[PDB]
Each structure stands twice: as C-alpha cells, then as structure tokens.
Amino acid sequence: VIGGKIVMYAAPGDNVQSEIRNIVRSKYPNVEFQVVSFNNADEFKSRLLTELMAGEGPDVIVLSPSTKKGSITIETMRKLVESGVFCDLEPYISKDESINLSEYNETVLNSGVINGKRYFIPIAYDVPIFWTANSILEENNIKDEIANWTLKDMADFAVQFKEKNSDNYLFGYGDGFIRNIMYANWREFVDYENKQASFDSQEFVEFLEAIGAIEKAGICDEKLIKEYTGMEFEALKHGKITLISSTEYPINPWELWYRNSHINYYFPDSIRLSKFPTFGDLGRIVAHPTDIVAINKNSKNKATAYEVLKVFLSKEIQSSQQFRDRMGIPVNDEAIRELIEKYSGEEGKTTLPTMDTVPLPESVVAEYNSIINGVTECVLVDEQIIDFMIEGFNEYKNGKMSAKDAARMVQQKVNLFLNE
C-alpha cells in the first residue's frame, strides 16, 4: 500500500521537489507530503544532520553534499553514510520489476554502494574537466596536445606560460580549480577499503610541486570573474584567463551548449574540453556525485519513500529545466541522450541573452562523450580529505613547509581521519 505521510525537507533554493510531489501524487493519490522548507542554509544542514544522527529526520533525504554552486557542503558525508543513518536500498531495487539499472549510469550509481550496501542513489554527478576556446589553444600551439596532457605536461606549460605572460592569469577561476585537481587525484593517495593513505611518498611530493608550478602561473579569483558582464567568456576574450576549470557548474548537456554558444559569440569558434591532467601509472578518470537521495533508516513508511525516491531518477525529472539549473550531470542515460539530441539540432539554433546560438558541433559532442563515457569510477569522497590535501599544498605554496614536510602533514591528518 503506497500512501501515508512522507516527511521531507527542502533546502533554500530547491525547485525540484515540487515536481516530485506532483508526479508522486499523480500516481498514489494517498501519499501525504509534509514539507518543511528552509530559508537559511546553516539551519537546514544543522537540523537535518543532527536529527539523522539522533534517529529522527525526514523519510526521504535530498542532499547536495559536494561543492557545486548551490550546494550545502557536508564535511564527512561518507562517514555519515557509513554510520547507517540510511537504510539499504537493495531489498527495494531487487523486489522492484519496474526499475532496471541499465537505464542509468551504473558507474556513477555504484558510488552509492559503500561497504556492500546501496545506502543512497546519486541522481547527478560531476567530472573535473578544464576547457577553453579552440582558437586560444591554437594561439598557444596546444590544440592537439591538451587531450593527452599529464599533470607535469600542464605544469611545464604553466612555467613556460608564466615566463611568457606576466600580467594575465593562465587559469580561472576561484577555489574550485585547485579542488578540481584534488577531486581528480585524491584516489591516487587514499585507499578507503584498507583505511590507509600514501601521502608521505615521493609521488605526492612531486604532485605538490606540480600544482605549485601551475598556481604560480595565476588562478584568478571568483570575485574577478563576476565583475565581467560576459562572465568567464568575456574575461577569456580579453585574455585575463586562458584555461578554465571550475566547480560551480557541472557540464550537463545545456552547459556544454551554453559554453560553446558563448565562445562562438566572442571568437566562429567552438569549445574544447579535456579531462583533468592526472598523475600515476594507471588510467583513472574519477567522478564524484553532487546530488543524492536516500531513505531514513528510522522511517516508518518505507516502500512509499522508495516510490518517491525513484521519481528523482525518471527521464522526465532528469531532463527537466529545474534539474538542469540546480543539479549536476544527470545519471539517467536516456535523459542525457535526449538532451544532447535537442542541442545538436534545430532547437540548438536559437537565441541566448542577446546573441545567436549554434547547435552543438559533431566535434564537441564526440569530445563530450569521450569524457563522460571515459569515467572509470565514481566515489563519494569525504570533503574533509580534500580539504586536508589543500591545506597541505597551501603550507608548501606559502613557504611555510617544504614539499616533504607538507606531504607528511597531510599523511598524518588523513590517516587518523580514516581510522576515526
């Protein structure tokens, strides 16, 4: 029997849950939604997390725990999941004929499988990438080399760039750029299964030295990009930045068409994208979820809560306008398939505030597909681990410690974080 009360909380900027309720109420008209809306971000995070760890809270939990634009960043989301505040979703997925995991990005969905239990469903994710205009790549003679760049190839371009351009930044923008380097390379130094890290290693020292040369070429602040009327595209046109990597906007099909159209406005040009230059001998391309849904372990109306949870995965929700504005890259494969088709055809030839847009070029779609289809794993990482890596890099960058002392400090804090 699908019905009864379902309690769920709404974060300040939430516009998707109202969609879910109408669809959920279209079927099962007996579901009684009790919505608690929040206007303060700190009151939402404080009340939700404290209630879950005290055995209370809403029946269905919608969270944005990473660092994208409208997120409520949670420091130890993975440890919170490991404490068991959410129930295992496998008994519901197994019993349900109507759901089939082949329709979704299974590599991303596996981020919700921790310690052998499907604790949550990631409805959207992000892949750290850097992008720019193609004509800017040809002006720097790296049009055909950034796709095969290593992190040391990028640092060596940054030193050569810093010696060439001494009044412009090489990268933008904000703190999201350096976090993107950590998002792409933390797996190289952290073994969650065995609860140990290898930050006190020659690889991480060279990793810090590589980031140090990259940052010396300049990363403009987020407060310098908002000053431009054309945002990062205008600053790219004026030469203030050359390569862009940011955490604010995951590259959903709309963002790709939006960036390509804006770049074509300032330059006949197209967007060029690439996965982040990574370290190591292995071929890891690591994504992380930005939006998750789960059921409270102490909910007395499960199965009804599971029915509400599934609507977040539907092609209709995942391809909606509200989902595009507030969530990351959708995990429903048909939604991505439908969205790319829309911006690759006549609907991609419209107007954007005003400028004339162009449909996505075949070249851009193939480069986009090579990245999302190239994701090798998707892991929910504790944001605190990423913060430890950054505060270790800042000690070396700010001349407070040597590279080997900063690698040893990160190894300490992370190893004792993994072991409680």
Author numbering: 33 to 299, 301 to 386, 394 to 460
The study reports:
Clostridium thermocellum has extensive potential in lignocellulose biorefineries as an environmentally prominent, thermophilic, cellulolytic bacterium. Previously, five putative sugar transporters, denoted A to D and L and belonging to the ABC transport systems group, were identified in the genome of C. thermocellum, and the solute-binding lipoproteins (SBP) of these ABC transporters were shown to bind different dextrins by isothermal titration calorimetry (ITC) assays. To gain insight into the structural mechanism of the transporter specificities, 11 crystal structures, both alone and in complex with appropriate saccharides, were solved for all 5 putative sugar-binding proteins, thus providing detailed specific interactions between the proteins and the corresponding saccharides. Combined genetic, biophysical, and structural studies have provided solid evidence that transporter A and transporter B are the major glucose and cellodextrin transporters, respectively, among the five potential sugar transporters in C. thermocellum.
The unliganded CbpC and CbpD structures were determined to 2.00 and 1.50 Å resolution, respectively. A Dali search using the CbpC structure revealed similarities with several sugar- and other solute-binding proteins of ABC transporters. However, the expected substrate-binding pocket between domain I and domain II in CbpC was blocked by an additional loop that was absent in the other proteins, suggesting that CbpC might not be a functional sugar-binding protein. For CbpC and CbpD, no interaction was detected for all of the tested carbohydrate substrates in both ITC and NMR experiments, suggesting that transporters C and D are not responsible for glucose or cellodextrin transport. However, regardless of the exact specificity of CbpC and CbpD, the knockout mutants of these associated transporters clearly indicate that they do not play a significant role in the utilization of cellulose by C. thermocellum.
